[PDB]
Amino acid sequence: AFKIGLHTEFQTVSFSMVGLFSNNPHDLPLLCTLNKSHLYIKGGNASFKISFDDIAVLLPEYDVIIQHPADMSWCSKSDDQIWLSQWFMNAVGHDWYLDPPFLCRNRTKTEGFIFQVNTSKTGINENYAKKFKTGMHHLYREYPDSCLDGKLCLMKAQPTSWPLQCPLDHVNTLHFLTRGKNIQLPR
Amino acid sequence: AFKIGLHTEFQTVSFSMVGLFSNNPHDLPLLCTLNKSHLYIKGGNASFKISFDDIAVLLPEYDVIIQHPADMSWCSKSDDQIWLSQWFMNAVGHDWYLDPPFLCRNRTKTEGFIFQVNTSKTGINENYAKKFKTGMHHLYREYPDSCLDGKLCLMKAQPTSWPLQCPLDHVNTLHFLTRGKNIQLPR
Amino acid sequence: AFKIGLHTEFQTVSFSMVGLFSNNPHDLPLLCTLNKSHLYIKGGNASFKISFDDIAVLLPEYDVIIQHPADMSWCSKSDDQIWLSQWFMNAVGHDWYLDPPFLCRNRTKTEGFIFQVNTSKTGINENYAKKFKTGMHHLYREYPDSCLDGKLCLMKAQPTSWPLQCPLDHVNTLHFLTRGKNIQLPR
Amino acid sequence: GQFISFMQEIPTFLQEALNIALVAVSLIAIIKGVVNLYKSGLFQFFVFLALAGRSCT
Amino acid sequence: GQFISFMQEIPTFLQEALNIALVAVSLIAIIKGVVNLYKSGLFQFFVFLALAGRSCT
Amino acid sequence: GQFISFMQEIPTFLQEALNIALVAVSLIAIIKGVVNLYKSGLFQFFVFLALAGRSCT
Amino acid sequence: AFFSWSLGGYCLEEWMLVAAKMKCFGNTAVAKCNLNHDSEFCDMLRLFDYNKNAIKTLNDETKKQVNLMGQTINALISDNLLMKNKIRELMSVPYCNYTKFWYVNHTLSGQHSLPRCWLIKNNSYLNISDFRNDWILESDFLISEMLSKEYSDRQGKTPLTLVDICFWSTVFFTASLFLHLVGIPTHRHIRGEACPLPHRLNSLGGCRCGKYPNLKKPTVWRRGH
Amino acid sequence: AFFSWSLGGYCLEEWMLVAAKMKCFGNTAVAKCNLNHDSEFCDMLRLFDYNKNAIKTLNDETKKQVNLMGQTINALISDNLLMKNKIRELMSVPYCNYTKFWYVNHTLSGQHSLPRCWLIKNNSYLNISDFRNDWILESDFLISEMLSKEYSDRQGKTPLTLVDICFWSTVFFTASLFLHLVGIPTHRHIRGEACPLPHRLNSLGGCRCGKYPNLKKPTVWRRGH
Amino acid sequence: AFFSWSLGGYCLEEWMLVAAKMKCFGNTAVAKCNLNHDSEFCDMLRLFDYNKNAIKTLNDETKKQVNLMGQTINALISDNLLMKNKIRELMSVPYCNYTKFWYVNHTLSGQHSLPRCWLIKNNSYLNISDFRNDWILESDFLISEMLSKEYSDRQGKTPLTLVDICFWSTVFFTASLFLHLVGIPTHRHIRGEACPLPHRLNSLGGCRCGKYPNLKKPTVWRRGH
Numbered sequence A, B, C: 001a002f003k004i005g006l007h008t009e010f011q012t013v014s015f016s017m018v019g020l021f022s023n024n025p026h027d028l029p030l031l032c033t034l035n036k037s038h039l040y041i042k043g044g045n046a047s048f049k050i051s052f053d054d055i056a057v058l059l060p061e062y063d064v065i066i067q068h069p070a071d072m073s074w075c076s077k078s079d080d081q082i083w084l085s086q087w088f089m090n091a092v093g094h095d096w097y098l099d100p101p102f103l104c105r106n107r108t109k110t111e112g113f114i115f116q117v118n119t120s121k122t123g124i125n126e127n128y129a130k131k132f133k134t135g136m137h138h139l140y141r142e143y144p145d146s147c148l149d150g151k152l153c154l155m156k157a158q159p160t161s162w163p164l165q166c167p168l169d170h171v172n173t174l175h176f177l178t179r180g181k182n183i184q185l186p187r
Numbered sequence D, E, F: 001g002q003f004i005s006f007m008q009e010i011p012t013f014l015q016e017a018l019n020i021a022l023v024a025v026s027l028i029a030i031i032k033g034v035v036n037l038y039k040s041g042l043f044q045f046f047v048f049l050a051l052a053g054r055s056c057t
Numbered sequence G, H, I: 001a002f003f004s005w006s007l008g009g010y011c012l013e014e015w016m017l018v019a020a021k022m023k024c025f026g027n028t029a030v031a032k033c034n035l036n037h038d039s040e041f042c043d044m045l046r047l048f049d050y051n052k053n054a055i056k057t058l059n060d061e062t063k064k065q066v067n068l069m070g071q072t073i074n075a076l077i078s079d080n081l082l083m084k085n086k087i088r089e090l091m092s093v094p095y096c097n098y099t100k101f102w103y104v105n106h107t108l109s110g111q112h113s114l115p116r117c118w119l120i121k122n123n124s125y126l127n128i129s130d131f132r133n134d135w136i137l138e139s140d141f142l143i144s145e146m147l148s149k150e151y152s153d154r155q156g157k158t159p160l161t162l163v164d165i166c167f168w169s170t171v172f173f174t175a176s177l178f179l180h181l182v183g184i185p186t187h188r189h190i191r192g193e194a195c196p197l198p199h200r201l202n203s204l205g206g207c208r209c210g211k212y213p214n215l216k217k218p219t220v221w222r223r224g225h
């Protein structure tokens, strides 16, 4: 805010995101980044945390190999969680009947909700790793990638409580709503 | 048409819809509202009448539970009627493999064509009632809703002749053509 | 370039397509027309030649009747070719579960890759002939149609080498990329 | 025919102080110019030429 | 109040040759007009009227 | 260099009645101004100063 | 072709207007939406132009049995504007449905404003008492636009250099007028004597021809004799 | 309704600005994006207007439980601009994320430029040394715009015909001024004689009343006596 | 960055032009489509700019192996314009395919029009006899635009108040010129007598110093002696 030239001044204006995000009567999706591995998505009443590491927690010889969106109904007990899962997978750009499947746990267990995706950077899956990669690159406005050319890069998503520190990003919300269609946000 | 100020006059112009709707060489969909319950749709050579009331005419233990668009082929004898039915259902915004199904009659009967949708405003279906509701709200430019919080609100669609009194609305035609894609209108 | 009026001259500017098509780091689809029957498509590493004539090379009682995109996986040995085939079929505007199927050869043969579509101009298929027709009319910027009202008009697609004489059209590339979505072009 | 349009639209354009000022200045200048032409005597020379040879009054 | 704004913004507008030329022409014209009015004697007539009947000097 | 551009584009701009009227008015005014300067005698004063002390003719 | 006119103009016939007549719009008025994507009137005008050209092509008998797609219609109508209108309807605020348009007319020269959309509410038409604040503004803008248009029309013909030359010539003429009006003294006269011309005296009061002796006589500058 | 203003104007309150205050923008400044589809500031302004009207409709208690669609949001934000910004981010070039805007202010009359987007890079804000080349251009354009606006404001009120009439009257007045200044000879005088008026002599040197005989005497044109 | 230039300008090199040379366009000409979404030339220009910036980023070696999407291309080309062109082609009317453009050039000052698309038909190029009606209009518009541009360039520098003051000073000067030219009577003279000054007579014909008795002698206003 320094005087410029003569009789003309320099002044800036900045908008507050809290009012917009807490005032719109309809609910809106939230996407957040925490540190460099804790990626957060929230929609309706489903709050999912996403991490990338080198631990295997589901195997095709032990749980459900989701191949079609109809088969997705066996992974959760809540319609909101299923809707959010399908929403995210179609936003990323996964072709269900053309790309290798992903793994999910069946509802008849007292464990919880977990779903795992293989995005390793070797072999055939290398190619898939590209596609998914670009997907996330077009939503979070950034990408703190946390897996190199190592043998495995497994992504796990699990539902946790919403931390009260996340930056209230909105470009991600705009891209989320822009990419997918036929989506109605509740109150 | 009253003189305004000085030397300047007030004049209005209004366009005629009959010429446009009867002059375009290709056929165009028609949507109409009659009284407060008779909703009309017309496409190609299929003219459907839609009503909302509290009468059950199909049961899942007696007729076809349509779950996939491939299964839709067992409800009609004409490709035009099947195309219009799928057109309308995708315009409303129904997810075939994620929402409760709807009921249709199989072709091997001399009765006719009837298809029924449950949009009641109670229980689980309450939520679905929202979705479908909004759908119709974005097509007819109005919505003379004819079912309250009562126990059942069943929508029935049946093919009848086209009444020669319907207002020639066109905003509905624009929204119809705008929402769905990969649609070719015949002559 | 003739002098116009006084002190004002006439001059034109024309751009070169070779530089654009050979300089963009990412690969782009190519569509070409040769003589009046040799239609060419090229994407990634798959180069397909399309012809229209009156020869039957596949029969439903001898090879695969592709009905669903999942079933498409039995026609080729390369993911790029399958992706290009699905890309083209969805660009043309074929509804897999609503229109008559098309025929393909299963991978377990040392013959090659061939796929055939029926677009005859008689009987029921007449109607389908319209749809597909319009499809091609919106991609090649022209259409040297090579089959009249005769009994059969069978389209065959087979992979060949890329001729080094094709005009470097780009309106077709624009329409190709415009129509279909969720498509990532590799390098 | 802009003059005719102006003579038609005088009442609307009269509502501006600049307009009345300019038109008053123009009218005063025209009439003063007539006065100065009269006080010149070029018209007197024309009358003298038109009178030469008729009467000596 | 455009005159006040101009008197405020003189230093910025002085940087143009056309501006200084026009203002110099206007000032010269105003002072020459005062000179010509003085050399007229209409003010002399006003003084004569205001003096008539007071003193014969 | 707008003057040079105008002297280059005279034939195109001559096709308008307002243009020929304005240029004729300007030329007439310039030559009449020369005439009036001559009839003044400021140049006569300059000649008198340049002549003072040379010859008494 | 289609509606990309680069400038007594566009006219519409009976089967377009509800009054079953023909109305023509000035080229200046029509050109105001050759690049505007936010005017309901011009979207409907493009639709009617497509209808007319379809009629012409059928008359030409091209016989290209090409089935229409929804994409062509979506490429003529501003879908953003339609969504905005539907949002307005859902929010219970005034909107219009592409049926009735109004404009302010200038009878003296036939100039008119570009028609706007007569907004509706509760299946009725907004009336004069609520629509008042717009006609006066539209008429004032119309008069201002006409004056500015005429000013620009004469602007685009006369070089500024000629105007500047004329102005400077006028100021020179006026300065010379005054300069002649006052007049300047030309020679010297001895105080109390007659005009010594043509014998031009020096500052000393004498002449170099010998007629006027150098007697230091007083000299005063004079113009006339 | 919504943001289609046809022209001390638009103001924003605490829950919009991070400074928790209220700022008002001039109508001339706001009107500059009633048709622009390439300004990040005005897209966010439309979003905030939609929020405010949703508040108003909830206060009206319309009770229309209509679930929001992504289409409404996509019909308010320029998705082309968002894709361009994301392309910039992927290409590692400066971009902005709809948080901070800057403008050049004119304190004397309260006129200000339309705010631009303070571009970012590497999770930082571009600073003065790189942003210098824009403020000077913006300020010069601001001053030029103010001068042109005032010129057009006076332009749209006075007829050009009146100006032309005044100019021609002035030139006629000046010509008459000079014409009176010089003066013209009126009659004839015999060389060496006095004024023969009122007896007006002919070209022969005599008069037709008989007072002046036709002696072919020399005659010279004179004005005064 | 990309094509959002806020104002000897943009130039294109060999691998863009078919003539294998370099051509530069004036900034005023280029700026005419910083907001236009209906010009085939500027869509292709944006495509070429994206190609050039991709080259630059590869040279920078960002190594971000991000697969291209069709959405980026769709966000650079006006898909509405492409659909309109394809509609024209299906209707057998002239259209163009982004290969050849033409413009009217002004050699004296290097000013040129914005290139248009040389329309095609039946795999041929429309020729002079059909394209005649456009060059003359384009050239006239070019000359008018140049004159208006120069007028606005001088407009945006000089205050209107100064012009008004100069004009009023000129009219005052002229009025004073005439007023001095005619001259006004100053005192009274008795009919048949000499100048009584400095003794200023009254209306009665006498003076209050006693020199001129009050004899009701006739008096006439005079200026000179």
Ligand SMILES: *[C@@H]1O[C@H](CO)[C@@H](O[C@@H]2O[C@H](CO)[C@@H](O[C@@H]3O[C@H](CO)[C@@H](O)[C@H](O)[C@@H]3O)[C@H](O)[C@H]2NC(C)=O)[C@H](O)[C@H]1NC(C)=O
Residues within 6 Å of the ligand: A056, A058, A059, A060, A118, A119, A120, A121, A122, A123, A125, A126, A150, A151, A152
């Ligand atoms: C997630 O995807 C990764 C992609 O790398 C899978 O790891 C890969 O698993 C395959 C299984 O066939 C391994 O192939 C085998 O590797 C060695 C030779 O390298 C040998 O045992 C066999 O001849 C065969 O080729 C492949 O090596 C391995 N990749 C790496 C880098 O070790 C992983 O299994 C996937 N996880 C799940 C749960 O599907």
Ligand SMILES: *[C@@H]1O[C@H](CO)[C@@H](O[C@@H]2O[C@H](CO)[C@@H](O[C@@H]3O[C@H](CO)[C@@H](O)[C@H](O)[C@@H]3O)[C@H](O)[C@H]2NC(C)=O)[C@H](O)[C@H]1NC(C)=O
Residues within 6 Å of the ligand: B056, B058, B059, B060, B118, B119, B120, B121, B122, B123, B125, B126, B150, B151, B152
């Ligand atoms: C169309 O949808 C409506 C949605 O209300 C269905 O009506 C609902 O049917 C269920 C069937 O399980 C009823 O639930 C039962 O209700 C009572 C207690 O209220 C009791 O018998 C059971 O414990 C059970 O909860 C539900 O009450 C009923 N809704 C209402 C408002 O009566 C309807 O059946 C659907 N129609 C078809 C053909 O599917």
Ligand SMILES: *[C@@H]1O[C@H](CO)[C@@H](O[C@@H]2O[C@H](CO)[C@@H](O[C@@H]3O[C@H](CO)[C@@H](O)[C@H](O)[C@@H]3O)[C@H](O)[C@H]2NC(C)=O)[C@H](O)[C@H]1NC(C)=O
Residues within 6 Å of the ligand: C056, C058, C059, C060, C118, C119, C120, C121, C122, C123, C125, C126, C150, C151, C152
């Ligand atoms: C590709 O599509 C064409 C569409 O014409 C198929 O040709 C049609 O095949 C049907 C088979 O039922 C023929 O129908 C039969 O024709 C005669 C009477 O015309 C008679 O044998 C039967 O009563 C029956 O109607 C039909 O004629 C024939 N069309 C023509 C013009 O000859 C063709 O078979 C399709 N090819 C494949 C491989 O599916």
Ligand SMILES: *[C@@H]1O[C@H](CO)[C@@H](O[C@@H]2O[C@H](CO)[C@@H](O[C@@H]3O[C@H](CO)[C@@H](O)[C@H](O)[C@@H]3O)[C@H](O)[C@H]2NC(C)=O)[C@H](O)[C@H]1NC(C)=O
Residues within 6 Å of the ligand: B017, B167, B168, B169, B170, G097, G098, G099, G120, G122, G123, G124, G125
């Ligand atoms: C939406 O546009 C429709 C046309 O699609 C407009 O419909 C018009 O509604 C007015 C209402 O007063 C009708 O005026 C009167 O209607 C009847 C039948 O003609 C009669 O009482 C009078 O002679 C008079 O015309 C008008 O006819 C009708 N036009 C059509 C073609 O239906 C309507 O104005 C727009 N919506 C609303 C809510 O106003």
Ligand SMILES: *[C@@H]1O[C@H](CO)[C@@H](O[C@@H]2O[C@H](CO)[C@@H](O[C@@H]3O[C@H](CO)[C@@H](O)[C@H](O)[C@@H]3O)[C@H](O)[C@H]2NC(C)=O)[C@H](O)[C@H]1NC(C)=O
Residues within 6 Å of the ligand: A017, A167, A168, A169, A170, H097, H098, H099, H120, H122, H123, H124, H125
């Ligand atoms: C993208 O927009 C976000 C908002 O969505 C902007 O976030 C802002 O980032 C700046 C960075 O300096 C923060 O400033 C400082 O942050 C903390 C917490 O307040 C503290 O150190 C200072 O008091 C100061 O405010 C600012 O708070 C933060 N605002 C929000 C709402 O998160 C951001 O500027 C934009 N992106 C980039 C890369 O700049």
Ligand SMILES: *[C@@H]1O[C@H](CO)[C@@H](O[C@@H]2O[C@H](CO)[C@@H](O[C@@H]3O[C@H](CO)[C@@H](O)[C@H](O)[C@@H]3O)[C@H](O)[C@H]2NC(C)=O)[C@H](O)[C@H]1NC(C)=O
Residues within 6 Å of the ligand: C017, C167, C168, C169, C170, I097, I098, I099, I120, I122, I123, I124, I125
């Ligand atoms: C559509 O754009 C294409 C480019 O994609 C243009 O193709 C050009 O067509 C003209 C037709 O005269 C060709 O001119 C002549 O072609 C050959 C080969 O060079 C030769 O006879 C002459 O030397 C001359 O160049 C031109 O080469 C060709 N350019 C390319 C790159 O193919 C075409 O003009 C546009 N479509 C139509 C129907 O004009």
Ligand SMILES: *C(=O)CCCCCCCCCCCCC
Residues within 6 Å of the ligand: D001, D002, D003, D004, D030, H165, H168, H169, H172
């Ligand atoms: C339509 O073309 C009418 C044009 C009117 C021209 C106005 C002429 C004004 C003449 C004023 C002369 C000054 C007095 C001698």
Ligand SMILES: *C(=O)CCCCCCCCCCCCC
Residues within 6 Å of the ligand: E001, E002, E003, E004, E030, I165, I168, I169, I172
């Ligand atoms: C705000 O309204 C101020 C307006 C100032 C008007 C300027 C008046 C200039 C007068 C000049 C007269 C010439 C000298 C007799």
Ligand SMILES: *C(=O)CCCCCCCCCCCCC
Residues within 6 Å of the ligand: F001, F002, F003, F004, F030, G165, G168, G169, G172
């Ligand atoms: C390029 O900068 C050339 C600028 C030309 C200026 C025109 C000067 C005209 C002078 C006229 C004076 C009037 C006669 C004494």
Ligand SMILES: *[C@@H]1O[C@H](CO)[C@@H](O)[C@H](O)[C@H]1NC(C)=O
Residues within 6 Å of the ligand: A034, A035
């Ligand atoms: C993430 O960062 C926050 C903020 O500093 C910190 O509280 C939290 O523990 C971090 N998480 C991990 C796993 O380090």
Ligand SMILES: *[C@@H]1O[C@H](CO)[C@@H](O)[C@H](O)[C@H]1NC(C)=O
Residues within 6 Å of the ligand: A063, A064, A074, A105, A106, A107, A108
């Ligand atoms: C485990 O998941 C499978 C796959 O959907 C499902 O069929 C099965 O019922 C689940 N297990 C149990 C014990 O129900």
Ligand SMILES: *[C@@H]1O[C@H](CO)[C@@H](O)[C@H](O)[C@H]1NC(C)=O
Residues within 6 Å of the ligand: B034, B035
């Ligand atoms: C609907 O209204 C029309 C027009 O008045 C009338 O003829 C018809 O009978 C009505 N339908 C019913 C079911 O009342």
Ligand SMILES: *[C@@H]1O[C@H](CO)[C@@H](O)[C@H](O)[C@H]1NC(C)=O
Residues within 6 Å of the ligand: B063, B064, B074, B105, B106, B107, B108
């Ligand atoms: C009734 O519908 C079913 C479901 O499609 C179908 O299989 C069956 O054939 C139909 N009934 C008869 C008698 O054909």
Ligand SMILES: *[C@@H]1O[C@H](CO)[C@@H](O)[C@H](O)[C@H]1NC(C)=O
Residues within 6 Å of the ligand: C034, C035
């Ligand atoms: C197609 O045309 C090319 C170019 O003339 C020629 O070489 C080729 O043989 C043609 N193909 C056929 C099948 O005639």
Ligand SMILES: *[C@@H]1O[C@H](CO)[C@@H](O)[C@H](O)[C@H]1NC(C)=O
Residues within 6 Å of the ligand: C063, C064, C074, C105, C106, C107, C108
């Ligand atoms: C031929 O194709 C069918 C259909 O997909 C497939 O099941 C079969 O395995 C193929 N033939 C052989 C010999 O594998």
Ligand SMILES: *[C@@H]1O[C@H](CO)[C@@H](O)[C@H](O)[C@H]1NC(C)=O
Residues within 6 Å of the ligand: B009, G023, G024, G025, G026, G105, G106, G107, G110, G111, G112
């Ligand atoms: C404006 O009114 C006049 C009155 O004579 C009419 O002739 C003219 O057509 C109108 N202008 C239009 C409709 O554009």
